Ligand binder design. Structure first.
Ligand code: SF4
Ligand code: SF4
Ligand code: SF4
Ligand code: SF4
Ligand code: FCO
Ligand code: FCO
Ligand code: F3S
Ligand code: F3S
Ligand SMILES: [Cl-]
Ligand SMILES: [Cl-]
Ligand SMILES: [Mg+2]
Ligand SMILES: [Mg+2]
Ligand SMILES: [Mg+2]
Ligand SMILES: [Mg+2]
Ligand SMILES: [Mg+2]
Ligand code: NI
Ligand code: NI
Lengths: 268, 551, 551, 268
């Protein structure tokens, strides 16, 4: 049978959001591209380059008009008329707007495309903005994190394919199965928080007993995500807090890349 | 003369444009251009030195871990902090396992489709393909039955009419030299490689807290809590789980990746005679094992005019000769200040004015070492280890040459390593030697914890006045990496990254001299200027990373 | 002539003693004895009906899941509860995946070393061994290189002088008939089997909460919360993860286990002519798919005097003909009340008095069906499906016969299935057909959730007066299982388990008639009465579970 | 290179404690028996039977006197002179006491051998007791659960081999890395307990949002273990509470097999 088409365009990306797919298990990246979808454009993996790969993008946008899922990683830079990311001699914002016209669904994978991320922090040298800001007439599905667990993306695409619509979304257009709850409202170290059992420095006696990381700067009280439950890499037990380091808030605008590692979170 | 542009270059990290002048079917001049900038040096400025590593790690997600580790080393250099030995063992295991994933994916997912024709694989006889490997590999997944299953997955993808990322490829090009059987073997190994790289990243995850983008570092050591008798921390059960994944990497690396590297060289021997980018090479020592940021497992050094016999060893990350030689220029780059700059005095002031052949044409800066252009990465790293007389490196290269000699009747000399295929060989040698780094450092960590040392972290103090400087070196998968931090009144006043793809991909410099990518392309034959596969083969051998090169 | 004891029987679950009179080189008479009792029926008495399943699951950890599921079905029968269809899909996936693990481990870890000589595998030529499988299997891990790695693991174990659990085995015995090459193939497949069974148990874990001993059941349905859009519950990501493991099981089952079953029969054809235990067979239907505890995917029935043409179909777990026929006796067992008892009126009063050949000699009771001895398990299950004209079963058996025909030039008729090797074949057929059950039920669950049905549990009410009787039937890996619950004044007043190894292993009955293990051994040739391998071969074919048989 | 010897004896066992080894990953069961240990006696896997396997046990107890680790699963029945478990015509208590004489270390794997477990519950028809009760002059290491995660056992054996002594133990002789903390003092659903967000029945709205299972009968407040952190089967996210069912207390004497599923726990 025919497979559902996907077009993937990178803007001011670091490639970590593509690289998340190389850790996935359900599906693995090889089963994704041979069995689940037809990946019609992706510059990291494509056999074709240059003029050939731009022709195959144009052909796919025509053939699959109204049918494809468009995916973007990285922020989009608006300063100085788009010149801080130029592909085939044109601003990346123009390539993204053209591809959006025919998309059946549009997904911002990672914090950079979802809300500007690290690229839009500090002084914001390039006037970097989110995918939703570049496409104000479109519903953009946001899958934040730096990078997210790849299955927060893959299970969103599966819901579209299997059931014919997107998963249920919150008021930031994030899927509820992955972003519907604060990390601190589902964290296994909450008993220690409640009891006043805190790590004060890495390597201290409470740290070496797995106590709460609040006083090291944990941003779990102010960050929506599934890091404590789904975790990472499907080996069991692996997320930043379980390894011994506070959450930095990388999912959440105004927390990650803004607040210092050891700055304390606000508690509701 | 004809002029071509290759934009985008695919099967790399990030955004690269290559332009070439061609005279009578031969490249006469080339231009390399990084086409995307973020300003990551400016984003990290005016912050606490402790915060830098979490921000600058996001320079790149392909070479994740590397900028995190360089950044903490830079802060520790400025502050005069000696890192606990256990923290060094953990940092080393993460870097070695990460680099194993990175090299495997580069050879198979990024580079193989320059050399392999998937349509030709449909014509193969799977039994003849398996018989070709008898006495050449002991790998357990080279049967006719494995190769038939793979051939059927190709058949089904073609029959669907949806080739997607395998479309409008270079099928039937005159530069495609493999027989159908060898093309089918390579596709089978491409798929098998994806399992081995996944196991390498499970090592990284169990110490880092996730990957991509680890979260276990600190200025002063690591955030892993070592306690063999503790619930919810780094105990003996967790260490046993790490070891179970370390042990799964060796067979694929030794019996598949190493062997395929020799086989590609045997079928493409002209690619031993082209793609030389430089006559000077730099690498830094790596994997410190003492209590004072030194005693490296792998050596570093500087080679001038390809003379291994008179190279200069580098044994310390505080080496004043290495530190004083590094500068960058922006004469042909889109920044304002053009004269060569030492990185502690660097600026990064954007000044975009469009493309000019003789003016500015790239977001990459132009690095020099005492005024000379230098190649970094696995070719540099291998040549320095041979110059040092490292027996492990000699013996590994000799195992690749022995398979090449069984297939061709010919040996390889060192002169033939200054080439596109020599660069690929250096990367495979690195990946092989990293498996004993993993075993060595896992054993060192178990032993040290058994003597009673559970220490992981030295808490910094950062003076609230004064101005002071540090530099963190690291031998990354693409070559020597350095992060340069200036602290003034307790916050970052300057931050400059000089990244291995910056050395290799940078444009013409303050003296108009040519860097490695541009120099490597002079002399490249181009059979079909509309489909310049030969140019892409040489550029891919450097493993371009443009998020790294530009930041 | 002489009298022998085999005590312990190894490579089973639990504690079994077998005695045999040998006369003129053949077994003339046998005794089967379960030598350990716990009293699980008494431990669960006087409790709330909702609690029973967590206690009686611990009857057995080899056949984990089975007693848990039979117990909730028994309470649901007493209370007249209709289970939600989503709860049935989940129960069904758990039972099918568990049973895949159970059969694989039985054929390889428990039975293979009756038929395979590990020492002889050291003499094999690995290339000749791989060539023997050309045109016979498409499995991807039959290469000479795989077989050489496995041979080197055997060579290293032998060279250590610590053979441990592989020591003092039956190496060189005259009943060992495989050539060196086939012994090496079998050892390679033994090791590969451990990976496949691990994948099967990952399916069980993701729905059960762990394995051994699942923790997701309830009287009224299951504890899994279905919500595609929920964090921390059974959502689409979790369902995709389950599917990734279901898809990993088929190739080993079809290309290795199914093929090895035919190969063992080809080399041991006389084992098609001995080991008949009974002329009557019973199985229950399994895998309900409607909203009212019926519409089973697999059929059940009763065969009398080996006549398939006149068998009695069973299509309901409420069938009064099945229920009314079942009794147990303790004439030759260590309990006080000896007359045949219907299980709702059963007692379990211990009365140990030592071993007597003509008196009491086992903790296992003696079950009958309308006064007859009956075999249960995979041979019964297969024969009932063939009697029902089930095309899937016909077709799978025919695939095994076709491999046997290619190897021997001989065919296999239904009369030859009433034997030690027929029993083994029935088990393999069941494992193969279960892979379609998993695909079917996964698809049914995804489709039903998509129609908007997320229901999983109906909360029970239990009247505080009255007497209620319920029975839960289940087709377990070893055969028909039944749990019989009487509720009086809101608590369990009687609890009786009648387990498939009880039917097959039980001693002489109230009429002194012989049950299947004891009957199967009459006529067994024994070349060396000190090392009675031939006896153990026939007993292992029934897959004994003595924790199950006795409880 | 010689491997450390192990003798495994089953008494009133269900075989679930041996079967936990078939789910293990570090080491797998095949790596355990070929690389980590020499398994000198184990009736579930042994090639030899009957008189040959009893010869093999005798020879190993002699060759390896003072060197082997003795493991027992199942309770040991003392009623009526030991006849409720008879192997080779002798009570299992006699086999166990004779093997204990020459042991370097002694481990009770599972709640049955650790404290009597299900087989000693209710009226205790067979006078079932724990391994420490049968061996009063010996230090028995207890690894409870029904069955435990196999790595609670395998990392205990690894500590003995690698470092030459047992792991640190609590006052019930249980390893502290696995049993040092109450499940409720390291449970990811603690935030919902704190907020009064409780499932009332399976399939209700709160159950379907992953709320606390206290009012369904969760025994986490009174059970020591690592079920919420180490979890089961190494796939990620798998333990009874995460699947939707309360903890039953199977680790803990007086809780599992004594209290009803829906009976409420005492909270400290
Ligand atoms: S979200 Fe993070 S991982 Fe993804 S492109 Fe941005 S910096 Fe990279
Ligand atoms: S502050 Fe962080 S570690 Fe502590 S309970 Fe909250 S999310 Fe968990
Ligand atoms: S502890 Fe549980 S799994 Fe282990 S023998 Fe006892 S009942 Fe079986
Ligand atoms: S009662 Fe149970 S589910 Fe609730 S927080 Fe405690 S251990 Fe977790
Ligand atoms: N390796 C790598 Fe990335 C580049 N170039 C860095 O540092
Ligand atoms: N299968 C199984 Fe166990 C037995 N006999 C049960 O029921
Ligand atoms: S830093 Fe990011 S990955 Fe999760 S633990 Fe915190 S949201
Ligand atoms: S029932 Fe047992 S397995 Fe853990 S979750 Fe509770 S102690
Ligand atoms: Cl420690
Ligand atoms: Cl739903
Ligand atoms: Mg220093
Ligand atoms: Mg820079
Ligand atoms: Mg209801
Ligand atoms: Mg009974
Ligand atoms: Mg006595
Ligand atoms: Ni990079
Ligand atoms: Ni059983």
């Amino acid at each position: 049978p025919q497979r559902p088409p996907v077009i993937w365009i990178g803007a001011q990306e670091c490639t970590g959001c593509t690289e998340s797919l190389l850790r996935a298990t359900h599906p693995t990246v090889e089963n994704l591209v041979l069995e689940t979808i037809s990946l019609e454009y992706h510059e990291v993996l494509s056999a074709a380059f240059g003029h050939q790969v731009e022709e195959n993008k144009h052909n796919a946008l025509e053939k699959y008009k109204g049918q494809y899922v468009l995916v973007v990683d990285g922020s989009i830079p608006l300063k100085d008329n788009g010149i801080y990311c130029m592909v085939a001699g044109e601003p990346i914002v123009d390539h993204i707007r053209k591809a959006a016209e025919g998309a059946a669904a549009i997904i911002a994978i990672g914090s950079c495309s979802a809300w500007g991320g690290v690229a839009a922090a500090g002084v914001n040298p390039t006037g970097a903005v989110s995918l939703q800001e570049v496409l104000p007439g479109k519903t953009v599905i946001n899958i934040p994190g730096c990078p997210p667990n790849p299955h927060n993306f893959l299970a969103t695409v599966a819901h579209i394919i299997t059931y014919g619509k997107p998963p249920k979304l919150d008021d930031k257009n994030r899927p509820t199965f992955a972003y519907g709850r604060l990390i601190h409202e589902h964290c296994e170290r909450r008993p220690h928080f409640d009891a006043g059992r805190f790590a004060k420095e890495f390597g201290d006696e409470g740290h070496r007993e797995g106590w709460c990381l609040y006083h090291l700067g944990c941003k779990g009280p102010e960050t929506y995500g599934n890091c404590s439950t789904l975790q990472f890499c499907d080996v069991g037990g692996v997320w930043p807090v379980a390894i011994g380091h506070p959450c930095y808030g990388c999912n959440e605008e105004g927390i990650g890349f803004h607040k210092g590692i050891h700055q304390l979170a606000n508690v509701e | 003369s004809q002029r071509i542009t290759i934009d985008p270059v695919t099967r790399i990290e990030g955004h690269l444009r290559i332009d070439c002048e061609i005279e009578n079917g031969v490249v006469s001049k080339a231009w390399a251009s990084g086409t995307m900038w973020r300003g990551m040096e400016e984003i990290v400025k005016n912050r606490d030195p402790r915060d830098a590593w979490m921000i600058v790690q996001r320079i790149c997600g392909v070479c994740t871990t590397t900028h995190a580790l360089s950044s903490v080393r830079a802060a520790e250099s400025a502050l005069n902090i000696d890192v606990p030995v256990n923290a060094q063992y953990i940092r080393n295991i993460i870097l070695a396992a990460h680099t194993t994933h990175d090299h495997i994916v580069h050879f198979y997912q990024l580079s193989a489709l320059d050399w392999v024709d998937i349509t030709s694989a449909l014509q193969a006889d799977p039994t003849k393909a398996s018989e070709m490997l008898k006495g050449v590999s002991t790998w357990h997944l080279n049967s006719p039955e494995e190769f038939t299953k793979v051939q059927n997955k190709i058949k089904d993808l073609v029959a669907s009419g949806q080739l997607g990322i395998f479309a409008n490829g270079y099928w039937g090009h005159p530069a495609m030299k493999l027989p159908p059987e060898v093309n089918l073997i390579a596709v089978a190994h491409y798929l098998q490689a994806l399992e081995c790289q996944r196991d390498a990243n499970r090592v990284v995850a169990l110490l880092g807290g996730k990957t991509p983008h680890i979260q276990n570092l600190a200025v002063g050591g690591v955030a892993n809590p070592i306690n063999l008798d503790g619930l919810g921390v780094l105990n003996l059960e967790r260490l046993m789980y790490i070891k179970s994944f370390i042990d799964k990497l060796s067979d694929f690396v030794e019996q598949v990746y190493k062997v395929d590297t020799a086989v590609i060289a045997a079928f493409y021997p002209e690619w031993l005679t082209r793609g030389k980018g430089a006559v000077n090479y730099l690498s830094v020592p790596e994997f410190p094992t003492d209590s004072k940021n030194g005693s490296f497992l792998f050596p570093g050094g500087y080679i001038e005019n390809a003379d291994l016999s008179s190279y200069r060893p580098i044994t310390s990350h505080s080496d004043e000769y290495l530190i004083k030689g590094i500068q960058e220029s922006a004469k042909h780059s889109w920044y304002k200040d053009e004269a060569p700059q030492a990185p502690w005095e660097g600026t990064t002031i954007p000044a975009y004015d469009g493309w000019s052949d003789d003016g500015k044409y790239s977001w990459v800066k132009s690095p020099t070492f005492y005024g000379k252009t230098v190649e970094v990465g696995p070719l540099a790293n291998m040549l320095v280890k041979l110059a040092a007389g490292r027996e492990s490196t000699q013996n590994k290269l000799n195992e690749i040459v022995a398979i090449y000699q069984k297939l061709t009747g010919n040996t390889l000399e060192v002169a033939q390593l200054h080439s596109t295929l020599g660069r690929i060989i250096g990367r495979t040698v690195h990946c092989c030697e990293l498996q004993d780094i993993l075993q060595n450092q896992y054993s060192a960590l178990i032993t040290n914890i058994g003597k009673g040392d559970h220490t992981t972290f030295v808490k910094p103090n950062i003076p609230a006045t004064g101005e002071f400087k540090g530099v963190g070196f690291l031998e990354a998968p693409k070559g020597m990496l350095s992060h340069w931090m200036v602290i003034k009144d307790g916050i970052i006043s300057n931050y400059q990254a000089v990244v291995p793809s910056t050395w290799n991909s940078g444009p013409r410099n303050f003296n108009d001299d040519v860097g490695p990518y541009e120099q490597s392309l002079v002399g490249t034959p181009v059979a079909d200027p509309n489909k310049p596969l030969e140019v892409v083969r040489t550029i891919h051998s450097f493993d371009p990373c443009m998020a790294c090169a530009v930041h």
